[PDB]
Amino acid sequence: SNFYEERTTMIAARDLQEFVPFGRDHCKHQKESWQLRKGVSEIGEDVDYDEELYVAGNMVIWSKGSKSQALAVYKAFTVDSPVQQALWCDFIISQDKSEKAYSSNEVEKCICILQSSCINMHSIEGKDYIASLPFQVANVWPTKYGLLFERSASPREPLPTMFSMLHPLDEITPLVCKSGSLFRVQYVVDHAMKIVFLNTDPSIVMTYDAVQNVHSVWTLRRVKSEEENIVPELCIDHLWTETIEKNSQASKVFITSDLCGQKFLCFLVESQLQLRCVKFQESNDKTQLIFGSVTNIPAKDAAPVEKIDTMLVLEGSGNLVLYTGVVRVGKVFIPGLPAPSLTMSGTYIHSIRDPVHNRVTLELSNGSMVRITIPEIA
């Protein structure tokens, strides 16, 4: 007899609901995009709030609601030309004078809407900032210090390709980079370097080097007073380059933690169907990051589920698999929606997105979208 001796683990997903972005209803009527993040509840309020930032054509819809409450609040913005990009961002108002772990910078939170002609920043407190950039914007990224712009491509004096904006009314300034050697700072001018990820805490940037086909991670910080070299405000400071087969630009990047607190920086390399997960941790003197082993996890797609310290992985086969960091926990089962080897339906999960609390969106192959709950394995 087996005597309860363990062999296989199966995870019960539950609380399945059709998902259609809130903003889809409140817009003109075809390209659309959105992102979800957690909203804030009041102190000791027992409810999970979602925020959605939705974009279609000339409109941006911000909304906040709950899966448990009927009504959501929303704010619509309409501009005159197609929205290139919309994002949440924040600008430092007052720098933290304290070393204590509870202390932080006072900041001004905004919704940033980018058009061809200009950029608009709408603060939560009610200020509309209007600015424009002297060049074409390929992409913009929120950072700990505001916004970071990538310029589209159009003696020897190359124009810098990356620019920070520390306050919506301030002049933008070129980014510099510092890269350590064994045996100095300079302007970012390489067009081969592509940003793929920003994070605020820890304050880092991940880039893909399009000619050497390897990713790098950097500390994003203020320039030091030895800026003897228009003067930069921010700097990217090389931390790590992967040791690695064609290696494409990462399609998705995120941080996850396992059950015992080990963090990983994970980036999905589509061309190899791998999720590369690199351990990292803060220095014990807390001045910078330390990087450990990298693990390749087979994946078509993946999403961190932060509230419960696990990560969902979608395999090439269409199987959903739950991880905690790089340790596989088990297959995830969804009532009504079998894996492909278990159904005659042509319907499979095409992709995974919008993790908030313990819920995640599945994009299904028949066009529709479904939101599910992943239980604590805690």
Q: How far apart are the first and last CA of the chain?
A: 29
| 240 occurs within a structural domain | yes
**3-state SS record for the chain:** CCCCCCCCCEEECEEEEECCCHHHHHCCCCCEEEEEEECCCCCCCCCCEEEEEEEECCEEEEEEEECCCCCCEEEEEECCCCCCEEEEEEEEEECCCCCCCCCCCEEEEEEEEECCCCEEEEECCCCEEEECCCCCEEEEEEECCEEEEEECCCCCCCCCCEEEECCCCCCCEECEEECCCCCCCEECCCCCEEEEEEECCCCEEEEEECCCCEEEEEEEEECCCCCCCCCCCEEEEEEEECCCCCCCCCCEEEEEECCCCCEEEEEEEHHHCEEEEEEEEECCCCCCEEEEEEEEEECCEEEEEHHHCEEEEECCCCCEEEEECCEEEEEEECCCCCCHHHCCCCCCEEEEEEEECCEEEEEECCCCEEEEECCCCC
What is the C-alpha to C-alpha distance for residues 335 and 32, in angstroms, rounded to an integer? 29
* Range(s) of the domain holding residue 232: 9-378
| 179 occurs within a structural domain | yes
What is the C-alpha to C-alpha distance for residues 179 and 236, in angstroms, rounded to an integer? 8
What is the C-alpha to C-alpha distance for residues 361 and 18, in angstroms, rounded to an integer? 9
- The neighbour count for residue 272, using CB atoms within 10 Å, is 16
Q: Residue type for 44, please?
A: G
Strand partners of residue 123: 110
| 2 occurs within a structural domain | no
Omega into 304 within 30° of 0, i.e. cis? Answer: no
Is residue 134 exposed (0-12), middle (13-18) or buried (19+ Cβ within 10 Å)?
exposed
What is the C-alpha to C-alpha distance for residues 362 and 374, in angstroms, rounded to an integer? 12
- Which residues are CB-neighbours of 175 under 8 A, at least 6 positions away? 148, 160, 162, 163, 164, 187, 188, 232, 234, 235, 236
What is the C-alpha to C-alpha distance for residues 333 and 276, in angstroms, rounded to an integer? 25
What technique determined this structure? X-ray
| 4 occurs within a structural domain | no
| 331 occurs within a structural domain | yes
Strand partners of residue 197: 206
What is the C-alpha to C-alpha distance for residues 221 and 207, in angstroms, rounded to an integer? 16
Strand partners of residue 156: none
- Quote the number of domains for the chain: 1
Q: Which residues of 146-175 are buried (b: 16+ CB within 10 A; e: fewer)?
A: bbbbbbeeeeeeeebbbbbbbebeeebbbb
| 147 occurs within a structural domain | yes
Q: Which two tokens stand for residue 315?
A: 């395999």
Closest CA to 78 of 62, 105, 60: 60
